[PDB]
Design a protein around this ligand. Structure first.
Ligand SMILES: Nc1ncnc2c1ncn2[C@@H]1O[C@H](COP(=O)(O)OP(=O)(O)O)[C@@H](O)[C@H]1O
Length: 312
C-alpha cells in the first residue's frame, strides 16, 4: 500500500525526465556499466529522493543515501566510497552543502574512480565503478568543477494541477479510496505544485471523509478538510501567508533583503529561500530585485487589501 513510485513507469508528470532516464538507464544496463553520475535539482518535495531511488531500482543496484552536512571530514566520504559495490548508487542529498574540502575528494572519485585523501601523507586507492546521484534545491550554488562532472542533469519543476490530480487519483486508488475527479482537482489545486504535499493532503482529506463524511473523496469534502487544515484556495499555509503579510505590514511591500525578512520572521535564510519563496515567485506573488524581495499587486489582491499607489 505504498504510494511512492518505485519504477520509472509510475513517475507521473515529468515526462521529459522519465523518458530521458528510461533511455540512459536502459543503455547503461545494456553495456553492463554503471550509470553516469546524475544531478537532480529543483524545489523540495518534487521527487528528487524518489528519483534517486528509482535509478538504483531500475539499474538493479544498491543505493547508499547520505547528505552534505553528514560528511564533516574527507574521511567520512572516503568510508562511504570504499564500501560501495561495483555499480552501486551513492546518493548525496543537499549536495551543495558539502564543505569545499570534502567536495575535493569527490572530483577524482567521480572522474577517475580513484580515492585521493590525506591522512601528512596522501594515499591513492582504486574504487569500483559507481553512480553518484546528487540532489540540490537548485544547481546554481554548486561549484563549476562539481557541476561539470555530472554526465546526466535532470531539472524538476513544480507540477501542473492536472498532473497532481493524476497523482492524487493514483494514490487514492492504491489506498483503496473512492475519489471523484473534482475531489482530486480540489486537492491538486491547493497542493503547492508538489506531489509530497498533494499526497500528504490526500491522507488528511481521507481522514475527514471517513470521520465526517461517507468515506469517499468529493470536492466539498476536500474543501472542508483543507479549510480545517488552514490551507487556503491557492495552497498557502500559515507560514506562506505570514511571509506575505510581514512583507506588506512591516516592510510596506518591500524591497526587503533576505536577512531582514528572516530576522523579522524568526526563520532561517534557507527556509525562506528554498522552502517558502520559489512557489510564491513562480506564481507571481513575490519578485526578487537587486534591492530585495517585493510583493506584487497579486499579494495585496489575494488578501482583499487595497493595492498601494506610490513610488519606488
Ligand atoms: N513523479 C511523481 N509521481 C508520483 N509521486 C511522486 C512523484 N515524485 C515524488 N512523488 C512523491 O512525493 C513524495 C516526496 O518526494 P521526494 O523524493 O522526497 O522529493 P524531494 O526529495 O525532491 O524533496 C513521496 O511521497 C513520493 O511519493
Amino acid at each position: 500500500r505504498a504510494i511512492r513510485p518505485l519504477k520509472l513507469a509510475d513517475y507521473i508528470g515529468q515526462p521529459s525526465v522519465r523518458e530521458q532516464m528510461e533511455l540512459f538507464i536502459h543503455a547503461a544496463r545494456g553495456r553492463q556499466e554503471a550509470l553516469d553520475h546524475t544531478l537532480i535539482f529543483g524545489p523540495p518535495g518534487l521527487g528528487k529522493t524518489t528519483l534517486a531511488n528509482i535509478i538504483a531500482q531500475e539499474m538493479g543496484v544498491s543505493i547508499k543515501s547520505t547528505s552534505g552536512p553528514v560528511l564533516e571530514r574527507p574521511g567520512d566520504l572516503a568510508a562511504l566510497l570504499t564500501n560501495l559495490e561495483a555499480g552501486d548508487v551513492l546518493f548525496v542529498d543537499e549536495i551543495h552543502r558539502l564543505s569545499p574540502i570534502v567536495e575535493e575528494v569527490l572530483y577524482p572519485a567521480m572522474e577517475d574512480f580513484q580515492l585521493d585523501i590525506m591522512i601528512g601523507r596522501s594515499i591513492k586507492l582504486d574504487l569500483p565503478p559507481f553512480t553518484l546521484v546528487g540532489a540540490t534545491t537548485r544547481a546554481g550554488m554548486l561549484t563549476n568543477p562539481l557541476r561539470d562532472r555530472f554526465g546526466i542533469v535532470q531539472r524538476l519543476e513544480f507540477y501542473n494541477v492536472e498532473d497532481l490530480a493524476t497523482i492524487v487519483s493514483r494514490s487514492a486508488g492504491i489506498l483503496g479510496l473512492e475519489i471523484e475527479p473534482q475531489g482530486a482537482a480540489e486537492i491538486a489545486k491547493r497542493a503547492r505544485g508538489t506531489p509530497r504535499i498533494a499526497n500528504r493532503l490526500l491522507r488528511r482529506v481521507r481522514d475527514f471523509a471517513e470521520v465526517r463524511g461517507q468515506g469517499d473523496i468529493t470536492r466539498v469534502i476536500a474543501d472542508k478538510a483543507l479549510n480545517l487544515l488552514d490551507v487556503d484556495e491557492r495552497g498557502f499555509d500559515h507560514l506562506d501567508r505570514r511571509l506575505l503579510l510581514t512583507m506588506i505590514d512591516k516592510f510596506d511591500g518591500g524591497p526587503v533583503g533576505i536577512d531582514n525578512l528572516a530576522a523579522a520572521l524568526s526563520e532561517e535564510r534557507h527556509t525562506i529561500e528554498d522552502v517558502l519563496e520559489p512557489y510564491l515567485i513562480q506564481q507571481g506573488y513575490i519578485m526578487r530585485t537587486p534591492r530585495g524581495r517585493v510583493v506584487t499587486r497579486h499579494a495585496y489582491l489575494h488578501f482583499g487589501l487595497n493595492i498601494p499607489k506610490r513610488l519606488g
